[PDB]
Structures are given as structure tokens and as C-alpha cells.
């Protein structure tokens, strides 16, 4: 039903100074927190109004684990560089993600603890949350460290106990922003590409959250391979945009229907190009 996420990116800059650490936190598709080690005042900062009300202990706590993770990933970047036998002249990336998915009953649907090195999967917590998957031989060093610390059990307790409690806190404080579902505003645009062909583009605007499904059908049969999609994009006001397009023969436009699925709609919508 809802999700709480922590994202971190550690990027080394050989010769240009120490690695940069950028961390952000999301409730679903809304980013309420950020941390940047390059700021003059590297503290955790509110990105949304409803989290600005938190007291001083919250900001010392959030800035606390942001700085600690920044330190952790800086040491990890130099350790990974050695274990992979890589040159110190090159730049490398360490990404990580953790958080919980909470169901409508308030319980844990899924936990996540995972890292990626140079954009490739490195190590991840499995679904049972008692075990790890190491991507390569080097990652087995981290796995054995995790097992010696019994770290899966420690983080499972956070996922079950506090992660859900933090998410409930945010969903209450951010109730107006977080608990909304804005349905899409949908329409079909017609763009002739030639004398015998035209583009039918199905637009979806102003919808939240970002998850949506736009499909094209011809006489009821979905055109999976012939449909062009764009990455769902933020409008900047807290909503999202997407479109799906298909190239159709001129004069056959009426055989085609767009289908819009979004959780903000009472049910799926069907659209035709209206001439």
C-alpha cells in the first residue's frame, strides 16, 4: 500500500577530492529528505513541508545516520577498489537502497537491503530477510561480515518494528500529500506522419502516484510490440506525466483504443481519437 525508501549514492572523484555522498528518502513517490556531503552545512534537510515540524532529536538522528553511512561508504569505496584490483585513477560508484513496504493492515509486505557497485548488483537481502545473495566472489566478503555480525536479524527487527512505525508517522503528518491518489487526465492526440500514416499518442497527465499502465489495442487485440512509451516524468508540482504512441494506417484510426489503468481511477478508462 505504501513504501518508505532510503537511497544513497557514493561517487569517488580521483584527484578532485574525497567521494561525494548524496542520500534521499521517499515515502512512495514523494521525496521528503535529502543529504549532500558537498553542502556547506552537510545535514539532513527537509524536502517537504510536513517533515519540517520534527523536533531537534529527529534532525540529529537523521543527520546522524546520514553522516555515518557517508563514512561507511567512503571506506567501502576504497576497500572495493582494492578487492577488485582496480586503478586508483578511475571513478567508481556505490549505491544502496533500504526500506519497507507496508500493507493496508499495517504489516510488512517486503523489506529491502541492497547495494550496487558501478551500477551492477553487489549484495542484497533475500525475501526471508534471514539471508543474503552475493553477486560475485568479492561480495562474499561482505556476506561473511554480515553473517558474523548477525546483521540480517538486526535489520529485520528495524524493518518489522521501526520502519513501519516511521512510515505510519509520515503518512499521518503528510496525510494530505501522501495519502492522495490523483487520477490521470487522459486524451488522445493525432499526428499524421505521412499521407498514408499517422501517430496516435495517448496522454496521461496530473496523476499520482507515478505507477500507471497505458496500452493500445487494435480491434481489442493489444499492440505490445508496436507501442512506443516514454519514461514516466514528473511535472514538478507533485504529479506525473506519461504517454504511449502507436503508428496506425490513415483512415483506420477508429480500430484503435487506448486503455488507462491507474490506482486513482474508480476503474480503467478506454479512449478513442475523437475527430
Amino acid at each position: 500500500s505504501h513504501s518508505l525508501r532510503y537511497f544513497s549514492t557514493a561517487v569517488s572523484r580521483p584527484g578532485r577530492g574525497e567521494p561525494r555522498y548524496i542520500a534521499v528518502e521517499y515515502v512512495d513517490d514523494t521525496q521528503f529528505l535529502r543529504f549532500d556531503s558537498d553542502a556547506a552545512i552537510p545535514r539532513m534537510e527537509p524536502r517537504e513541508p510536513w517533515v519540517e515540524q520534527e523536533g531537534p532529536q529527529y534532525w540529529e538522528w537523521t543527520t546522524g545516520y546520514a553522516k555515518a553511512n557517508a563514512q561507511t561508504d567512503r571506506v567501502a569505496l576504497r576497500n572495493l577498489l582494492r578487492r577488485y584490483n582496480q586503478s586508483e585513477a578511475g571513478s567508481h560508484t556505490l549505491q544502496g537502497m533500504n526500506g519497507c513496504d507496508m500493507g493496508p493492515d499495517g504489516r510488512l509486505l517486503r523489506g529491502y537491503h541492497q547495494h550496487a557497485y558501478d551500477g551492477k548488483d553487489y549484495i542484497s537481502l533475500n525475501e526471508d530477510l534471514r539471508s543474503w545473495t552475493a553477486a560475485d566472489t568479492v561480495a562474499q566478503i561482505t556476506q561473511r561480515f554480515y553473517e558474523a555480525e548477525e546483521y540480517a536479524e538486526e535489520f529485520r527487527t528495524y524493518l518489522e518494528g521501526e520502519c513501519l512505525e516511521l512510515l505510519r508517522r509520515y503518512l499521518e503528518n503528510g496525510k494530505e500529500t501522501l495519502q492522495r491518489a490523483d487520477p490521470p487526465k487522459a486524451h488522445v492526440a493525432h499526428h499524421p506522419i505521412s499521407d498514408h500514416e499517422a501517430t496516435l499518442r495517448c496522454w496521461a497527465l496530473g496523476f499520482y502516484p507515478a505507477e500507471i499502465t497505458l496500452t493500445w489495442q487494435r480491434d481489442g487485440e493489444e499492440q505490445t510490440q508496436d507501442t512506443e512509451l516514454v519514461e514516466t516524468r514528473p511535472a514538478g508540482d507533485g504529479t506525473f506525466q506519461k504517454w504511449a504512441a502507436v503508428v496506425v494506417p490513415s483512415g483506420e484510426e477508429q480500430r484503435y483504443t487506448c486503455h488507462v489503468q491507474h490506482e486513482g481511477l474508480p476503474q480503467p478508462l478506454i479512449l478513442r481519437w475523437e475527430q
Binding site: 546522524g64 545516520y65 553511512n69 561508504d73 576497500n79 556505490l94 537491503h113 554480515y146 546483521y151
Partner: peptide, 7 residues
């Protein structure tokens, strides 16, 4: 405070 560990 405290948060994940990466070794």
C-alpha cells in the same frame, strides 16, 4: 547515530 554497515 546508526544505520547500515558495508564491509
Amino acid at each position: 547515530i546508526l544505520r547500515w554497515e558495508q564491509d
